[PDB]
């Protein structure tokens, strides 16, 4: 929850032991009280300008949550926070050395370093590992 | 012979015919500045698609 | 391993006599 946005990547993994600062917990403690049924204690009393906007607000709260669970769901990394993969890093993506990425770098600058290359990494996890391991697992159950 | 067991798959590329809602996705250049283009209704969805 | 099974059995037969 953005408390370490000026910290470094080699140090922000220390405070990330809290559940991304209880990231998703702020949603459930919100939608317990977003679903205060005073909206149902009125039926909004009409259709109003705000309730049009709240309806377009809750949808984005639904969709953009799902696009982050699905991508974690497909990567063999459902529900975890720090998982490793089988994909080898290609040095053509970034010729930065080891410590400069971790000890000597922010996060948002590192986004603009590989925002070009990000989409290639997405395919190169699924079709390289999570499509792939499931067949090789199923072969190991053939016996 | 061997015993067989059912195996679940996800993302299987099949389809049936359905009837759903499509949406307008028009041009998005020169819709501003007095262009009240009633077909565009001020550029209905501003996509300007890349039709792959 | 079949080829090992037969060999070990033959050995056991030899030793127990």
């Amino acid at each position, epitope marked *: 929850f953005l408390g370490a946005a000026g910290s470094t990547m080699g140090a922000a993994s220390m405070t990330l032991t809290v559940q991304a600062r209880l990231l998703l917990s702020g949603i459930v403690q919100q939608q317990n009280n977003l679903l205060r049924a005073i909206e149902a204690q009125q039926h909004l009393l009409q259709l109003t300008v705000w309730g049009i906007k709240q309806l377009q607000a809750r949808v984005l709260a639904v969709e953009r949550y799902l696009k982050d669970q699905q991508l974690l769901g497909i990567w063999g990394c459902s529900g975890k926070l720090i998982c490793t993969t089988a994909v080898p890093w290609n040095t053509s993506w970034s010729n930065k050395s080891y410590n400069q990425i971790w000890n000597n770098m922010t996060w948002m600058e590192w986004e603009r370093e590989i925002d070009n290359y990000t989409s290639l990494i997405y395919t190169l996890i699924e079709d390289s590992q999570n499509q792939q391991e499931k067949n090789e697992q199923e072969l190991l159950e053939l016996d | 012979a*061997e015993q067989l067991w059912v195996t679940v798959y996800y993302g299987v590329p099949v389809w049936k015919e359905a009837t759903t809602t499509l949406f307008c996705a028009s041009d998005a250049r020169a819709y501003d500045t007095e262009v009240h283009n009633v077909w565009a209704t001020h550029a209905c969805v501003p996509t300007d698609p890349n039709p792959q | 391993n079949w080829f090992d099974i*037969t060999n070990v059995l033959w050995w056991i037969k030899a030793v127990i006599q």
Partner: antibody
Amino acid sequence: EVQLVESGGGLVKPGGSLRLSCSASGFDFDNAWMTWVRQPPGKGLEWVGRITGPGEGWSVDYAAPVEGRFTISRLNSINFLYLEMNNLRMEDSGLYFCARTGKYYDFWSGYPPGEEYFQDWGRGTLVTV
Amino acid sequence: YELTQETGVSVALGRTVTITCRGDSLRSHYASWYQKKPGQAPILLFYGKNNRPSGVPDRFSGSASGNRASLTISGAQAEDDAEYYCSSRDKSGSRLSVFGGGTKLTVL
């Protein structure tokens, strides 16, 4: 209820290659030893080679006149047996059979590696060289 | 064909007949026996020291002595008119197998 159907046999020039297939059904193909047997024309049955199972590491053994030219393999996922033949000669031609292979060893009289027997056969597929 | 069989043997219908198979490897290894008619897959009749597969008639029996092995058909039938092959190791202690030349049994 065991069923074995050989396929892939046909006319081929001397020196050529060929790939016979065998679809296995009715039993546990996966752990089953499989064997290729042929019958040359106007002649009797002849043992070509045999692939073993998991415990044996899918080891394969071959008849001398065929060792080095032929390759036996399996894909247990669809219960198929295969026979890769290279550098064929006239005498390679005959009818090719695949057969489920059983292992036999009597303890008190046996001698390693006991004996292999052929409990189920297919109809064969015709190789013409 | 280190396993030697009779080329041809006849038997009166209903009578008893024994086909044999000889080789040095039989001193160490049993043989197994197969019936084959042209156009058909072979049939395992008998193997081991005393093993007959289910579905095979009782008229069939195998036996073994010294360097020879033999199949006995007691009360030969019309269906029994066929080719018979034995199979065993080619040498003693071999991982390889081999077939005899094959005996044609015509029923008279």
